[PDB]
Design a protein around this ligand. Structure first.
Ligand SMILES: [Zn+2]
Ligand SMILES: [Zn+2]
Ligand SMILES: [Zn+2]
Ligand SMILES: [Zn+2]
Lengths: 144, 144
């Protein structure tokens, strides 16, 4: 029965992420029209001023998709270009004042998702959460 | 830490299905060059002779993607067209003798995937599998 439940559970995630890149539980409270990745790019740029290369490394997406998402992001006056004193085809990205609340929302939407996972876990005792933790460790390794 | 582990586990599935539609664990033993969905279409057609509409319902994919996959499937002499005595734009699909071992492989790769899930579950006792089952029930409902 557990074999069929694991197949069912993984199947539900498949349907849920047929067009999404990341899993975010709840609804997006952003007033601006931006995709999952686009809003996340603003989130990582808020904490640290990142280059075109680091965005691809953090998001785990292709640099071709990065330039495609960054061009639509700078179009809506959300991100601004910057270049170092020792240029080695280096393009640093900075966050504008227009993007600051959007990045704040996504960071809150990520902690909102984790808090819902925390609740589901808190239904079980410390010794029960260990059994779940051990399972999710073995299962996650099949997808690595 | 469980909230972070759930976020990590779901993330590993995200990376796994970035180009996949269904989760199959193990390498594909098929000698013919066909995609995940293409080899799954042959599997469902082997047991029951399905119409162009039921394929979209079973696979949970758009009928536009169905015709795109069915045209490449009939090209390699794997599937054959059929029409009823009372035609109401009905296009029934039948499996050829060339496709029979391919559908058999896929069905065995799905049982190979379930058997690996069975193993991971069998590591835990009957009372421990209940704790996991209760968790996966509550978690799967967030993606429904
Ligand atoms: Zn995000
Ligand atoms: Zn958001
Ligand atoms: Zn399949
Ligand atoms: Zn196969």
């Amino acid at each position: 029965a557990l074999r069929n439940q694991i197949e069912q559970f993984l199947g539900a995630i498949m349907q849920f992420a047929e067009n999404k890149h990341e899993i975010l539980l709840g609804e997006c409270e952003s007033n601006v029209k931006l995709t999952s990745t686009q809003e996340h790019i603003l989130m990582i740029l808020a904490a640290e001023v990142s280059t075109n290369a680091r965005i691809a490394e953090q998001l785990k997406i292709s640099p071709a998709a990065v330039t495609k998402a960054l061009k639509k992001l700078q179009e809506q006056e959300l991100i601004k270009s910057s270049r170092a004193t020792n240029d080695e085809r280096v393009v640093l990205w900075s966050l504008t004042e227009k993007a600051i609340p959007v990045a704040k929302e996504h960071a809150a939407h990520h902690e909102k998702t984790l808090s819902t996972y925390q609740e589901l876990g808190d239904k079980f005792t410390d010794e029960e959460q260990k059994v779940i933790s051990q399972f999710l460790s073995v299962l996650t390794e099949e997808f690595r």
